[PDB]
């Protein structure tokens, strides 16, 4: 689960497939566990995934999220503003 | 990744998210490892997966592919003809 009562408590992965909100206090949460250079490393993806289209091999499935968190974390870094985070559509 | 040197050598899992061809060699290889029967299996889940409602998990991703290779195994066992194979095509988009 990504909550424990009330306050988010997920790991970056677990997050990076699930539904919550980035605020101060999930961002704190996360930077804190995983932390900034890993997020800012996957938030570097983000352009390999944004469209990612093609095969994925085993693996990328999961970078792609990853990725799309990591820009969702960097962004909210940049301009304080809570945003609901979503992992991207994975479709045929 | 599926190859020792020259010849392939993946298990049906790796292989069904890599790129290989299907020729008479893998096929042996895939049938005497998996074998035929849940390569069966697997193959009768590929209508589900090709018209899949969007997404799909991670999850119901490597089912698809699972499914994939299975298929297009049991089409070489028809018809011999040597046949690439690549894991199937995805589309991925955010979600604000």
Excluded at 2 to 19: I, N, P, Q, R, Y
Excluded at 32 to 44: G, Q
Excluded at 80 to 91: A, F, M, Q
């Amino acid at each position: 689960g990504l909550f424990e009562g009330d306050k988010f408590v997920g790991s970056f992965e677990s997050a990076a497939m699930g539904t919550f909100v980035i605020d101060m206090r999930s961002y704190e949460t996360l930077v804190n566990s995983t932390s900034l250079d890993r997020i800012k490393s996957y938030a570097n993806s983000f352009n390999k995934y944004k469209y990612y289209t093609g095969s994925m091999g085993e693996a990328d499935y999961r970078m792609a999220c990853y990725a799309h968190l990591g820009k969702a974390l960097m962004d909210y870094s940049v301009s304080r503003n809570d945003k609901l985070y979503t992992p991207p559509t994975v479709s045929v």
